């Protein structure tokens, strides 16, 4: 039987840190600066005198510890007392509330798109797909078959083979295989199934 032949689709090896891919480098960088600045400002405003600085626990280290609890949404042991500190807290809370949601949404979308790939199956839709090209051997019986058969799908196949250039034809099986191997994904070839079964 005549057969179609294609390259293997390359296996999607995971990365060691692939989990970051939804969110892009620059955001990951800028979070650090926002964290540092927020913590420093919270400290400074907390420990300027209330009129006496012994009246609150918000030392530098405690100020760094509060903010990290807030970003990962795991609550905290202590809460800022003054109005200004409460303002700072509310702002940081809104920021994290936006970021975490965006991250989750994007990851879900990224996985979702992957499911409906629907790869080429039965190969008959090469009469309907056009992004992927396919070749045939010169002077082969196949070259006669598509002129000489007249079934509608093979008619449009032969029309494609007529019109497409650089041409579908090739002089040798060896260099046709070389073409398929180099032209990965975008190119295909027609051959006798016995020969494919030998090669593959």
């Amino acid at each position: 039987g005549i057969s179609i032949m294609i390259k293997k689709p390359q296996k999607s090896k995971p990365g060691v840190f692939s989990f970051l891919d939804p969110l892009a480098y620059e955001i990951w960088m800028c979070i650090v600066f926002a964290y540092i600045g927020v913590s420093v400002v919270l400290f400074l405003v907390s420990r300027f005198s209330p009129y006496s600085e012994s009246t609150n626990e918000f030392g530098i280290f405690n100020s760094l510890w509060f903010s990290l609890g807030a970003f990962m949404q795991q609550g905290c042991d202590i809460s800022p007392r003054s109005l200004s500190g409460r303002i700072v807290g509310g702002v940081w809370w809104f920021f994290t509330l936006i970021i975490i949601s965006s991250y989750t949404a994007n990851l879900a979308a990224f996985l979702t798109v992957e499911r409906m790939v629907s790869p080429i199956e039965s190969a008959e839709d090469l009469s309907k797909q056009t992004e992927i090209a396919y070749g045939t051997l010169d002077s082969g019986s196949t070259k006669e078959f598509f002129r000489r058969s007249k079934i509608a799908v093979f008619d449009k196949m032969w029309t494609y083979m007529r019109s497409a250039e650089p041409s579908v034809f090739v002089r040798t099986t060896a260099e046709g295989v070389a073409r398929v191997r180099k032209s990965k994904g975008k190119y295909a070839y027609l051959l006798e199934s016995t020969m494919n079964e030998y090669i593959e």
Partner: protein
């Protein structure tokens, strides 16, 4: 039949089914382990401080 030399195909169980592989989130565990490993040294230097007060 002697000349065929590639036959690796998913059998018994299948990679493609649905679930996230361990590899897909592998990275996180290394960060965790390193985090836990670091905190020991902090306590050790805290010991080395107080032990000659």
């Amino acid at each position: 039949y002697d000349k065929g030399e590639c036959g690796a195909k998913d059998s018994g169980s299948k990679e493609k089914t649905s679930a996230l592989s361990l590899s897909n989130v592998a990275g996180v565990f290394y960060i965790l382990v390193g985090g836990l490993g670091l905190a020991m040294l902090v306590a050790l230097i805290e010991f080395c401080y107080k032990s000659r007060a």
